[PDB]
Amino acid sequence: GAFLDKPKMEKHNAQGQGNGLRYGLSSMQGWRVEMEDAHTAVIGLPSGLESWSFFAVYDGHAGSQVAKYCCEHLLDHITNNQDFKGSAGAPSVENVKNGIRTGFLEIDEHMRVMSEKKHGADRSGSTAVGVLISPQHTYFINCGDSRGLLCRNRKVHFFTQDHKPSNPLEKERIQNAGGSVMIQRVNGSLAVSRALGDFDYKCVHGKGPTEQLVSPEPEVHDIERSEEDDQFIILACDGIWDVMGNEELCDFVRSRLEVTDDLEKVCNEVVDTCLYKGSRDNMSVILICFPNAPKVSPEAVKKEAELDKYLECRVEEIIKGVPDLVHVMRTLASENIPSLPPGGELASKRNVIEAVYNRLNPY
Ligand SMILES: [Mn+2]
Ligand SMILES: [Mn+2]
């Protein structure tokens, strides 16, 4: 219902290493009155899945309860059911895929009984996007309009398709559940067609759990791993993707990775860049890097130092009636400066531009 007067730009980070993987993450509240995003990041899983990893972003709505419960418990609902455990030995593709389906459906109903028993007041819901990573497979998991992508061989190899109510099959389901899609929203309100929680949207008599107005059913894709070609995976809520496309963000992260191996920092830059491109939502990014992720380049670091220094001289020159930061950014944009980070553009350089402005106009 409301925005803050000024954005909360404080970063919450995590990082880790194991099973040949490196990860960083960054979350920021931004312009929104609340922080309703959640996440999971775990390298090495219980019960003989030490060599497996799991990462996920949760974009909560109408509260954070559903998202928070998911970020702590979705993983064991997924792995601790009979479908995931099916066959005697290691789980098959089908096992893993049905395991995730069941995990999603069972946690949703689990939360529903919990809320029904304790007379819960919140009507919250949550998207989930994530990857379950085995020695030989990346399993992409999507439920809602959060998004994940795989960069392989300097390119977008795969990305998750957002569940929007106006998508043909989502629309079909919603209409069979006796609702409608008005513009982009389920009955004029909800901007997602798939999510955990939203129990008010799951009350149609004579319709299965996956045939309600809002569905908890996940979409899973098996991608065979490529030791040689797999570079990195990005997972993020719509707050990021609203203001950057797949190619852009993929290129941007690449440009950043060529400057630092610090992944929390790369994730920070994504979130800030997105804030400065005009995103007014909560923002959460997870970055998972494979052994052949882009490496720090001596030249790229130098190019960045030269750009940084150049940007600082430009700021000094511009302040000669003493223009404000907004007007300095305007001038710099109209200068069509070359060699700005791909995807990030000027926005990705605002922290550098602003630090300078503050050194020269600290009042
Ligand atoms: Mn949200
Ligand atoms: Mn959001």
Curated annotation (Swiss-Prot):
GO terms for molecular function: calmodulin-dependent protein phosphatase activity; magnesium ion binding; manganese ion binding; protein serine/threonine phosphatase activity; R-SMAD binding. The keyword Manganese applies. Mn(2+) 2 binds at D59, D238, D281. Binds 2 magnesium or manganese ions per subunit. CDD domains: PP2Cc. One of its GO terms (cellular component) is cytosol. A lipid is attached at G1 (N-myristoyl glycine). This is Protein phosphatase 1A. Mn(2+) 1 binds at D59, G60. The keyword Lipoprotein applies. Keywords: Cytoplasm, Hydrolase, Lipoprotein, Magnesium, Manganese, Membrane, Metal-binding, Myristate, Nucleus, Phosphoprotein, Protein phosphatase. Residues 22-290 form the PPM-type phosphatase domain. The gene is PPM1A. Its EC number is 3.1.3.16. PROSITE patterns: PPM_1, PPM_2. It is a lipid-anchor. Enzyme with a broad specificity. Negatively regulates TGF-beta signaling through dephosphorylating SMAD2 and SMAD3, resulting in their dissociation from SMAD4, nuclear export of the SMADs and termination of the TGF-beta-mediated signaling. Dephosphorylates PRKAA1 and PRKAA2. Plays an important role in the termination of TNF-alpha-mediated NF-kappa-B activation through dephosphorylating and inactivating IKBKB/IKKB.
